[PDB]
Amino acid sequence: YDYHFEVNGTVVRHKNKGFGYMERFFELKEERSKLSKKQYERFNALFNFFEKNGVICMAKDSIEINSLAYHGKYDVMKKFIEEQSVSIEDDYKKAFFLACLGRWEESYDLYSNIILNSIDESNGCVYYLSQINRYRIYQSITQAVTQFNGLGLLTFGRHYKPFTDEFLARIEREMTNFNIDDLFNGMPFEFQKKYKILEFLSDNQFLYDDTVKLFELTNKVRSEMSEGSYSFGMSSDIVVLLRLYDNLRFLYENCLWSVSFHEFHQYIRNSMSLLIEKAEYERTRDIDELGFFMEYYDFVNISRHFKIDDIKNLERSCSIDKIRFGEQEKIEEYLVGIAEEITKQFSANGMNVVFYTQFISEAKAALYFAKYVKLSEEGLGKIVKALLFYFPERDLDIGKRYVWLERLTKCNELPKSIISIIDDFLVLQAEKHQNYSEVSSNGLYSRDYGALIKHFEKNFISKRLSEITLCLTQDKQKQIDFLFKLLPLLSTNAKSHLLSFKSVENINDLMNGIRIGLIDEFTPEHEELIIEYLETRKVNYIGIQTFSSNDYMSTFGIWYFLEEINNSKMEEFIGMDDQYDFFVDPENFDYKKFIPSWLKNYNDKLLGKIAGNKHMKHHVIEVLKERVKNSNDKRYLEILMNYFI
Amino acid sequence: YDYHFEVNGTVVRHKNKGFGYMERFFELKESCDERSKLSKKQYERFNALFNFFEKNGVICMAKDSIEINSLAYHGKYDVMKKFIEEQSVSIEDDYKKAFFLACLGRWEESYDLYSNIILNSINGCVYYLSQINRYRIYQSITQAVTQFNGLGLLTFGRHYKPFTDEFLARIEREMTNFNIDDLFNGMPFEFQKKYKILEFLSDNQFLYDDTVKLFELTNKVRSEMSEGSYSFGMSSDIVVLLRLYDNLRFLYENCLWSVSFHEFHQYIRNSMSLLIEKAEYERTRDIDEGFFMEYYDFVNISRHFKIDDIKNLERSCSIDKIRFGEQEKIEEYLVGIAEEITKQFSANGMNVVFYTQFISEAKAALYFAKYVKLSEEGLGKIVKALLFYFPERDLDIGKRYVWLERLTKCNELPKSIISIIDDFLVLQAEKHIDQNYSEVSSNGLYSRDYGALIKHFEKNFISKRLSEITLCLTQDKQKQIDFLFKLLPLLSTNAKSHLLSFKSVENINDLMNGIRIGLIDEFTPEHEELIIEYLETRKVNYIGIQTFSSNDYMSTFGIWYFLEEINNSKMEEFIGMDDQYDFFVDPENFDYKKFIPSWLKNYNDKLLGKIAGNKHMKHHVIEVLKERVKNSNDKRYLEILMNYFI
Amino acid sequence: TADVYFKRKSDGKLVFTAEAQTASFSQAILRKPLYILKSEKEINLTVKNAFFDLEWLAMTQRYEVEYRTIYIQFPNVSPSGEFEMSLENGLAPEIKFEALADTDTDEMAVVIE
Amino acid sequence: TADVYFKRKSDGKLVFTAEAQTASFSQAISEEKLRKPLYILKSEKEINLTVKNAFFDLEWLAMTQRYEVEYRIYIQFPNVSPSGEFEMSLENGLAPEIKFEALADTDTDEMAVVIE
């Protein structure tokens, strides 16, 4: 505590009462020849150490993380593991890499053997770090076994048992009654005297200091944002970024497995998303009378330490597409590497479960965040092929995978190669359709892929799907009504052949026909079908109620409101559910049941028609005003400004 | 770690592999038929066990309101003094008395008492807690000494030295070589084994665990707020509140001085202001297919919140829509604060050590009192303490007026409070005889604002004493003359004429004061001549550097021209000197790229309506407002946008 | 503070039962013809204190959710398998699942009163 | 990383020097109801300022045993009141941060002057 070293890299004399060695040392660095030869060599070593660690100068006057684990060089790590480790130092990062690729049994054995061979250690730092890493690997093994015996049954269905019971018993026996907190105290006193900076690694909660400092900095930044003050020196945001990079580099370059735990993930997630929020506030900051862009490392951090829901929250809070993305070549290389790894592992006998649990959360986040990065046609094609065919469906279902694909297509339009990949995916899905159902958590099934294809081509005709449809027969109804939702992609002959078995029996078939464009105006038959469905719905409605998310009734109400339905029999059904009376009889709706969330589902045409009613516009304008003044969605405000509905 | 106890008070089996003693204890407690089969000595011990478990919490097993009792928390600065005076029966009575001594400043006496308690402690936990509290008192003494040496001269204007140099040297000699982290290790093995729960108190940063838990809960709560998810069980907000109360009751009840440090203040401020933010978001919940402040919440906000923190909390969430319960207790607390300030500064200065520690809470409480309904007697006491006896350095004229007017919100100004305002104004006028003396306010509000408040709440109030002074006024004392000028509405008709005899509109500031009081209702040719002459002077002084001040006079002239109050077309010659003057003089050719959205905040209903109805500059302002509302979360730009659609 | 029952879709066996802890229903809006009221609705549910049934466990060594408070039924609930390890040992297992909607049914969740 | 020079208002004496860290000007309109007539353009202009590392002049310290601020463009606050709010921390305390609020005399009616 003689001096205080700050994240910027400047030392301040804080407690040194005697002669100031650092004050003289910095000037001495800036006539050095008068020092002894040994002293000169030692000063050279000290200068190298200080400049490599970022201690540049005194108070009065970017980051590069060198590690294969951080960059996800999953094949270079495998090659390094394969190579014979010449020294124990090279065998420490080798065990770290073994852990990083799953392989926790191999990593634990390697750490144990490193500890065994570290008897003649000159300093013993490797032995201490190996003890820390072996405890961390044992923790990871225990938690993974517990998950596999628990969630590992619901997820994956089966029981996996990645680690043999003998290995688990042996590691439990060795790690019994192992208090990690004492590990630094149970060390030679020479190590404790020299390596005092490594003491914080011992305790089982070593990020508490970093988390508390980040909490203080977050509070300061949020106070600055709320007050609207202007920071002049090194802003608390810059301090947060500097400490985040210091922690990341220290934990990754020193090959510490604690970098893969939920605590560090959450610390990085909070350190980021506070830089991002502050940057967004800086962008949208009004001028008074009196920037931040994401690099490759920021992309890697967001992909690794952010869950999909966390990225969703970050998108909701602040607009990330307005933050310029730098080093896009490196980001594209990282994304292509992730896609290549997923395709290589799952295309060939599958990926080992231990590594999958670690790597899928980062692969999903990387492909989610790939929306804001611009990818080349080759890289985009590799990413799309990995996402569609080979990405596990237990994680990315059809609906969510389509959302991923469309987000990728946002920045870069769909090329011909990507359209061919989507055509292959749709052909495979069709050949899947057997008593097989396409369940999607998102509500965006394969027909949306064909819709995207048509939207980006408007003349695309898939050869293979057309040939399949020509080979359709009435017996297989599943494939028939699967291709019915893909009608625009089929050829004219394929369309005609499919229409032979295609009949609008229920309202779902009518919905699909409307979506594919087969239906442009209601014939009396369609009107009768809709009215009969309403009859049955009302009959079954008439002592417990049932609320469903079908939303067919809302669609009927919207059709009546837009005049697309011109039969005055729907009023007989008024009262079954809301959002149908809202469009059928807006005047008599009694809007106390109105839900402000409805207006987000409507589009430009429907919302303009609603605004122009002038017999129901004032209640909805009141609702929108309340939502805009209360909530911070900013979509209600966009609606209000666009047409004051 | 055999069991998991959480905030609500339900135990959870966590790592118990042997017989479950806690489940059986709860079963025996809930079904007391068995409690007789227990051995008589075992039953007597079970009685104390049940008492201890029910006092702390632990109501039952997992599968099946806070009251902090301490004179320090309630600010019973008079009961604490009497308690200190009384002879202490036991050592614990001395430990609590030393904590109270530390609370009322008096860190020398508290340090001495803690040293004595350490000497006489031969349980073993009282010695441990006395060591910790003595270390904390030494830390506070050292920090206060450093602040007085460096900051004290600037803030107070005079060096204080509350602690004698001999005492400081003695405490430095004693506390050197005392490592706080090893204070627990160097304990009897029995103490270390039994009192493992006190271990966390030994370290110099014992709130890191609590702060990290609060950070995790805050992140979870923010995630729910942003996503809009619905939490069914014990919500993270309830967990945060429960842990905040646990820490507050454990530190205050055990008389631990660490409760007075910045770390704990920030922990409580973050624990609160996150319950408040979540509660405010709860009212704005989006319907798809409450939280109120008690006496304890008010006390916590008063103590641990800075005025800027309270301002930020008000900014983020409308805190006037939060129900304030226990308003009788809140008013009693506020009256106690006001009475303590009056007792301090009415006679013989104050206790500087106690002042530095208590003024922040006094200011926060009187600022937060805007949300509580105070009786006429209590309100009058609070107003008298705020105006007459509150330190000048802390609350200036403008800030003090803001405090008073905020108090006026919930409780309208009565005649009793009007009398206090009147004699405060009389005292201020009495102060306005020295030519050097001039009331300066950081806010920009002055005694004229007090007069305006008095007139607004009465509209017929006549101040006998200020009218008397005006009748006594002479040309010699010009400062009193122009002080009473701004208070003309309060003066009587005879006083009005007597003051106006010597009162002349010499400069633009005099004209502005005349307009504000009401002496000017339409610009006479002389006033126009003065305005144009001042504009000539400003333009001449303008004519290679540019300096822009905050006088705002040019903006006032531009607004007058825009509203047709001034109807002489010579102002266009000065266009280009400063903005907000061209905007109102010649809006069409203003080049609104220099327009500042913040300007729209200063305008009022009449000016905003005129700006909106201009129709030759309304579109640019509507654009400015739309981007301001979209980008920012101020919620006032939206109000301006939708009230007049400017 | 209700209870959630996780059951096998085909056999109907109750996979487990736990306590509902969080539920997010966020449905919002490139994607002249007839209005179809296209929407992208999502329902996520985080569960607390989940213990797998001994029978289904021993058997394992499509799903439905019944969340009973008034009465909620989620058919086709896919259990998300995000596993993270805390350096602090561990404390109860938290299960998250997303409501799935079949194309034919088009219904994701049902509310029973 | 600009420097703030503290001067005694009466003379040219330097009270202390520091580095400007945070400056907030939250100057907007006040309550409408509580305060046909000629417009006056009421305002509640407030200017707060924070200095990170302030060392008090040795001569001023010795002598001590109204203030002006010059923030270096150049800004000048003729009258500033330093808010002496002292809070102690368990972590032994080391950055002495000075917060001061700009004041406005009634006659001048100006708080800060910023000039190129």
Residue numbers in the entry:
A (entry chain A): 336 to 365, 369 to 399, 406 to 634, 644 to 786, 789 to 897, 903 to 1005
B (entry chain B): 336 to 399, 406 to 463, 467 to 633, 644 to 897, 903 to 1005
C (entry chain G): 8 to 36, 41 to 42, 48 to 77, 170 to 177, 191 to 211, 214 to 236
D (entry chain E): 8 to 42, 48 to 77, 170 to 176, 191 to 211, 214 to 236
Text from the published report:
The recently identified bacterial Sir2 domain-containing protein, defense-associated sirtuin 2 (DSR2), recognizes the phage tail tube and depletes NAD+ to abort phage propagation, which is counteracted by the phage-encoded DSR anti-defense 1 (DSAD1), but their molecular mechanisms remain unclear. DSR2 forms a tetramer with its C-terminal sensor domains (CTDs) in two distinct conformations: CTDclosed or CTDopen. Monomeric, rather than oligomeric, tail tube proteins preferentially bind to CTDclosed and activate Sir2 for NAD+ hydrolysis.
To elucidate the structural basis for the NAD+ hydrolysis by the tube-activated DSR2, we incubated the substrate (1 mM NAD+) with DSR2H171A–tube complex, which was obtained by co-expression the catalytically inactive DSR2H171A mutant and tail tube proteins together in the same bacterial cells. We then determined the cryo-EM structure of the DSR2H171A–tube–NAD+ complex at 3.0-Å resolution, in which approximately 60% density was observed, facilitating the accurate tracing of the NAD+ substrates. However, we did not observe a clear density located in sites B and C; by contrast, bound NAD+ within the Sir2 domain of DSR2 adopts an orientation with a ~ 90° rotation compared to that seen with a nonhydrolyzable NAD+ analogue, carba-NAD+, which sits in a position ready for catalysis in yHst2 in yeast (Saccharomyces cerevisiae). In site A, we observed the stabilization of the adenine group through stacking interactions with residues Y282 and T52, while residue T248 forms a hydrogen-bonding interaction with the 2’-OH group of the adenine-ribose (left inset). Mutation of Y282 to alanine decreased DSR2 NADase activity by about 50%, whereas the T52A, T248A and W60A single mutants had a negligible effect on DSR2 NADase activity, highlighting the critical role of the Y282-mediated adenine stacking interaction in site A. Thus, we speculated that the observed NAD+ bound in the DSR2H171A–tube complex represents an inactive conformation.
